[PDB]
Amino acid sequence: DPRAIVEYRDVDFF
Amino acid sequence: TEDHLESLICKVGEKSACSLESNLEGLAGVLEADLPNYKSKILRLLCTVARLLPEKLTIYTTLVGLLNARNYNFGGEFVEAMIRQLKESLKANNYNEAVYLVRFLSDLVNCHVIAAPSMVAMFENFVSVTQEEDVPQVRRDWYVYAFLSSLPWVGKELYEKKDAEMDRIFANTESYLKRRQKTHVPMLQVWTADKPHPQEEYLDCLWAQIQKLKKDRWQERHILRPYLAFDSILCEALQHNLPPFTPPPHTEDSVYPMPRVIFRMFDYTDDPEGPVMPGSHSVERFVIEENLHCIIKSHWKERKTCAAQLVSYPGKNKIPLNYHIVEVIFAELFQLPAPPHIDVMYTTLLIELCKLQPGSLPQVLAQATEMLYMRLDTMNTTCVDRFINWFSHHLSNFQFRWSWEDWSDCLSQDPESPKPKFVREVLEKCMRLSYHQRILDIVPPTFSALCPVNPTCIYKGHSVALCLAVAFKSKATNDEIFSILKDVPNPNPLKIEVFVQTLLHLAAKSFSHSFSALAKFHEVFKTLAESDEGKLHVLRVMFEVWRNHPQMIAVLVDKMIRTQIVDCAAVANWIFSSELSRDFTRLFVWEILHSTIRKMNKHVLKIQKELEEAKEKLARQHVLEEQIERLQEKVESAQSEQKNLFLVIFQRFIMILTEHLVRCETDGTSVLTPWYKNCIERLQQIFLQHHQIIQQYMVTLENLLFTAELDPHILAVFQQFCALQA
Amino acid sequence: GLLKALRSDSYVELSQYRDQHFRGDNEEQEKLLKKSCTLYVGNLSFYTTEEQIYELFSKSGDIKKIIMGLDKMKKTACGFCFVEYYSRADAENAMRYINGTRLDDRIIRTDWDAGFKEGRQYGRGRSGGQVRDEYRQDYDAGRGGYGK
Ligand SMILES: CN1CN([C@@H]2O[C@H](COP(=O)(O)OP(=O)(O)OP(=O)(O)O)[C@@H](O)[C@H]2O)c2nc(N)[nH]c(=O)c21
């Protein structure tokens, strides 16, 4: 897999 | 023994050590023993299997035959119970269940439970519905269909007992079918072409099949009839008369099935090695496909069970079962207006079928896929989308393995044409399930022209965007970002341009980051796009940032509608605008439109159910009655918003279709271009997807939009839509 | 009426899994699991992007929320996620037709969840990732490599 392990760091009215 | 009774009645006909005849004999005995004090249960359970398991029709009629022979009064009470259940089903507009009950009563004549003159009397009354005036075609259609579709089972037995009476029915039936309207057919055909196979109208086709059956002395070669083995016992059994049957009359509460068009892609020459496939106009082909459809209807939730039951389908003679299964599956997937079950089920069922028959099924599947590709030129756009979605999702489950060079003929054709456009969209869909680089690998180097682009952000008041960049990075508040937007020169569309470009660029890493950005600066968005032309500009800018990543556009437009940054009307206009003129034929546009329409329709539904949950709370109890007056107002405002969304959409279709048709006769060019094919069929799609809602707007649509003044090309689509319930 | 044999819906029944950090009784958890619109999705690649999860799971219905499964220390994708739908029916269809099919060439497994809370996105393994990645002997390129 030639791609990176992604880093995830940081209300319905209708 | 009630739990035991149900499983005993259900299990007969399935896999067994003993034969079918043995199990029926045994069960008929066990059921007669339980008659003294479970007669009520057994009548109701046999009525239920008559209604819910039509794929096992002849197994259960036989069972009733044997019970009738041992106990006449049971057979009497059963025929009464079935007539009650039939009237119950018709009153409740369950016309599809009613057919199964009619066929059950029909085949009970073959088991010497019902007297043949009674069924001819009932069918006299059915076909007499074609004489009734001031009633819709679909009502008449159904009553004919219930009669004609019973004849493969009982057509011999009725014609030998009362041929005089039956010839009148065939005369009245034939006269009706001649004078029927066929306006619907171009809307429901998967392919407009009639080579290699005409996509026939469902009653025309059944008629042809019933004629060939009559011409062959009512001899058919497929239907398993267990009752023939019990001929000794069933001759001596005493018959019952059905009461005279008055068909429940038409009311404006009545809802009849839409007309259909018979899907057809195979004849015997597609499988020369295996058994000979019964032809399009044989009742064998009708009974096979009907039962296969019913098996899926009975087991759609259990994909592995559903595959097993299809593969183990019994018949009197051998048939190329893998071809029939693949056909019946694609017949449902491509059915118009809609498939009977959620689209994705079919992808999975086909996989479970490959697992269950790995030596043969994948080859038949690949052959069919090839044939579908070859016939793309006249395939309806609604169906082509389903084909794209199925095929891309299938490939994603088998390492994207496909002989792409088999389709090299697309590379020399016009990019707008159905075949290369099919391949482009398939590969675009593959990329979404995979990643850009993996799609470049799995295709030949001659096909990388048709590959999708890399899904990247296009980032572009030069100094103002640099200020905002710093403020977002530094974890600033809404007050500060709004303050920075004061310094912008007005030619205010440039405030939105510098805000959207910068926020989406800095949150371009994933969907979660982009969703966090919209939520964090929600108030800045709402202020910038409270204007109608402010909404239109947020969509225009957001497109220019993400025009390489269609999936991101779609999920953003969705979030923007859900949080009220924009509204459905803005998105509707935006789709028919000139900025998406180049990409108008591409799929993602119509994904976004339909997603938008769905949010609107669900919003109405939720408000509508808050209303009935309040009215039912009032009925149980007999301030709350004044809450009902408020909700009836919210419903009407919501329904108004809904109606306007459709009226917008239709207006824009009529405009751009008229603009094409006028310029075609002015310049003398061809009308039927690739762009026109897409557009006219995407209009047709709106009607198909939402026919029940659009039916509420008939008066407004006849008077103000779809009038006699329009080019009959555009008006045909509306008259087609009329025909679905007319 | 109906036949019990046809009502059969085995792909929607509850797994044997329960959540340990769940503040509550088992019968109180089961009651939430039977009304949930929220699915645990196991056996993802660490390279599997939200773009892919959204495309696949959209096929059973409109998605409310994807919450990626994160390493507690690194905040990298450690091989699972949660998927929330607006209706039960759409979640039921995911369990019926997406469960046990491929996503990024891996057979993924879905399960009913009692409902997302804060903290549940993080892997509860000792070294930050999922508990499943600490014990295991096998090599698996998409799941990091060897165990830990
Ligand atoms: C295997 N998992 C993991 N999981 C959730 O994913 C997060 C962390 O995963 P984990 O490290 O595998 O937790 P844990 O369940 O303790 O591991 P396990 O029980 O496999 O030993 C938690 O929110 C956990 O509840 C799950 N949630 C549901 N509903 N069903 C499941 O099968 C699983």
Numbering used by the authors:
A (entry chain C): 852 to 861, 868 to 871
B (entry chain A): 27 to 486, 497 to 527, 540 to 670, 687 to 790
C (entry chain B): 4 to 151
Reported in the publication:
The nuclear cap-binding complex (CBC) binds tightly to the 5′-cap structure (m7GpppN, where N is the first transcribed nucleotide) which is co-transcriptionally added to all nascent Pol II transcripts 25–50 nucleotides after initiation. We also determine crystal structures of CBC bound to ARS2 or NELF-E peptide that explain why CBC–ARS2–PHAX and CBC–NELF–E form mutually exclusive complexes.
A P1 crystal form diffracting to 2.8 Å resolution showed convincing ARS2 peptide density. There are eight complexes in the asymmetric unit with variable occupancy of the ARS2 peptide, probably due to the relatively low affinity. In the proximal site, Asp852 electrostatically stabilises Arg854, whose guanidinium group stacks on Tyr461 of CBP80 and forms a salt bridge with Asp107 from CBP20 (left). ITC measurements showed that the R854A/Y859A double mutation severely weakened the interaction with CBC, whereas F871D alone did not have a major effect.
